[PDB]
Fold this protein.
Amino acid sequence: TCPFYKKIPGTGFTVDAFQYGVVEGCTAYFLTHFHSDHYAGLSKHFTFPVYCSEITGNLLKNKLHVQEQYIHPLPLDTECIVNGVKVVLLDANHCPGAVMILFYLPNGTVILHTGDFRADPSMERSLLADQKVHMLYLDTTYCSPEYTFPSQQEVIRFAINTAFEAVTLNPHALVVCGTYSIGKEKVFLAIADVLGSKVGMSQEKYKTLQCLNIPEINSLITTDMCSSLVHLLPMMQINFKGLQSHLKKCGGKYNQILAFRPTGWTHSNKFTRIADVIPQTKGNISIYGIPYSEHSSYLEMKRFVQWLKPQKIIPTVNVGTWKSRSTMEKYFREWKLEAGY
Ligand code: NI
């Protein structure tokens, strides 16, 4: 049965709660974003109202084949009424179409659900600043002090300069970027822009990108692999065997590959800066691991919460074990005592 952390008190609303069949009481199911864990259980067979962003709506319609009658897209940054209750969607700074949801309860309680988010100081000057928030449903993916990582901009700069240097040294080099869902599109779009190229990709991947309301998208991407010197491939193929295999398939038009694996955090964040990063190499193939995160670091998450001063915090990530919940509670109390709420 549907856990209390996916339920919104004193409404019949739920959030990211599609895997438990019919939730008793629920009149409206909210989807923060189009990642499989959050959408899990939704399909063309679902027949209840789904509320979400316009991008998330495009994806449900075209990829999942959810029938149009059940998709209720809502605009960003606008007060809307859903089943008699005032709501706002805000940009989560996660993947394309990802939202936080602000719920104004009839009794006067205000609740923020972050979905998945990368906390940022621009969120301190949104509609969030206009009133007190009593309860926060928080993306605790990286809620521990060892989780640091560079800015997205630092990582992109590094990728751009690296790719440009390699292709100017060898204009028969191919650049490859690994991918498994939506998110992190700026990595491959910024590399292509510096090389003057479109990004080549499979039919299924192109169809996904064509849903994302990216301006001038037709001028940036293509299914013609031949005509393009940046290719997307599944993350599972970003290894020496997979990359040599792909290189054979391209028909002798390239003689070298530079590949990037965008990742979350891995243990080598604790010593290395972005400038010190060096690839793994076997013959004419090099693989760079670059820590491009679309979740809050510890410092970013702490800042956000200390600004917001919630009366109660409800974690939505790593809640399955008592040790994790206990550890997280410890950090929330520290934050509260330091800040004075
Ligand atoms: Ni996500």
Observations:
- The domain at 1-147+296-341 is CATH 3.60.15.10 (Metallo-beta-lactamase; Chain A).
